Write a protein that binds this ligand. Structure first.
Ligand SMILES: [Ca+2]
Ligand SMILES: [Ca+2]
Length: 130
């Protein structure tokens, strides 16, 4: 049911970016395709998308702290559940890193979340509801 070049999971469709852009330009691009940036709700959704990423690249996610107050918000305005997050050790790390990416670290090997700069172009993941 999903369009061309979109992975399928549950009742949604997910696009794994190859081009890089800023966080807002990435959300605008997901909106052009009638979607939003990735909003991770269940661990089954999280492990599915880790499986489909370049381990050597970071991927933008619809979680941001626009004020720097460490008040993380999903773009679909669903509640942020602190205890069920996938942060790497020591992250979040910088109040000026206000945008969340998925990235694979090498020692020890782990998939997780990391806060990075928002203007610095990265890859992205769009979530489209079907
Ligand atoms: Ca989701
Ligand atoms: Ca960081």
């Amino acid at each position: 049911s999903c369009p061309k070049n979109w992975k399928s999971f549950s009742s949604n469709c997910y696009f794994i970016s190859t081009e890089s852009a800023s966080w807002q330009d990435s959300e605008k691009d997901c909106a052009r395709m009638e979607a939003h940036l990735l909003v991770i709700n269940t661990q089954e959704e999280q492990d599915f998308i880790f499986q489909n990423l370049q381990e050597e690249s970071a991927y933008f996610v619809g979680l941001s702290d626009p004020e720097g107050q460490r008040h993380w918000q999903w773009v679909d305005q669903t509640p942020y559940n602190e205890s069920s997050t996938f942060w790497h050790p020591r992250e979040p790390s910088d109040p000026n890193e206000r945008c969340v990416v998925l990235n694979f670290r090498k020692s020890p090997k782990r998939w997780g979340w990391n806060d990075v700069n928002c203007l610095g172009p990265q890859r992205s993941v769009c979530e489209m509801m079907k």
